[PDB]
Amino acid sequence: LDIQRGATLFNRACAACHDTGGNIIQPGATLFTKDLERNGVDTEEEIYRVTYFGKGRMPGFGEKCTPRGQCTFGPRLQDEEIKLLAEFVKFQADQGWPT
Numbered sequence: 001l002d003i004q005r006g007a008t009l010f011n012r013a014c015a016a017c018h019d020t021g022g023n024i025i026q027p028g029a030t031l032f033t034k035d036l037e038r039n040g041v042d043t044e045e046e047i048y049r050v051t052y053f054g055k056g057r058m059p060g061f062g063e064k065c066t067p068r069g070q071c072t073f074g075p076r077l078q079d080e081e082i083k084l085l086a087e088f089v090k091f092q093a094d095q096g097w098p099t
């Protein structure tokens, strides 16, 4: 809901890999609606879950993400931050990642 706060957090925690909604590591697994839909995760609740726990080559960010090697070696994000990020991603995907 707070777009500017979500954008700021996204820019520092996510953008290097998901530049403008993309995926610089894994083609086909972007944050665009088409890929989110194909991968079964075009919802806020699914975006939150994958951000929290990770999946293959993406680290999880949740406080209770486990085991250690599947999660960020940087600081974990709080639930509220991951919720803001999931809402931001869903909103941006719905809008087509405006530039």
Ligand code: HEC
Residues within 6 Å of the ligand: 010, 013, 014, 015, 017, 018, 023, 025, 026, 028, 029, 030, 031, 032, 035, 036, 039, 041, 046, 047, 050, 051, 055, 056, 057, 058, 059, 061, 085, 086, 089
């Ligand atoms: C690189 C080190 C990444 C960072 C930092 C973040 N993500 Fe990521 N993400 C990355 C990869 C390699 C993948 C694909 C994983 C796979 O095996 O499928 C993803 C995937 C996502 C998805 C799902 C996209 C889809 O299925 O099309 C989402 C919703 C997602 N990532 C969100 C996300 C957020 C919110 C991040 C910051 C907190 C973030 N990612 C960081 C690589 C990387």
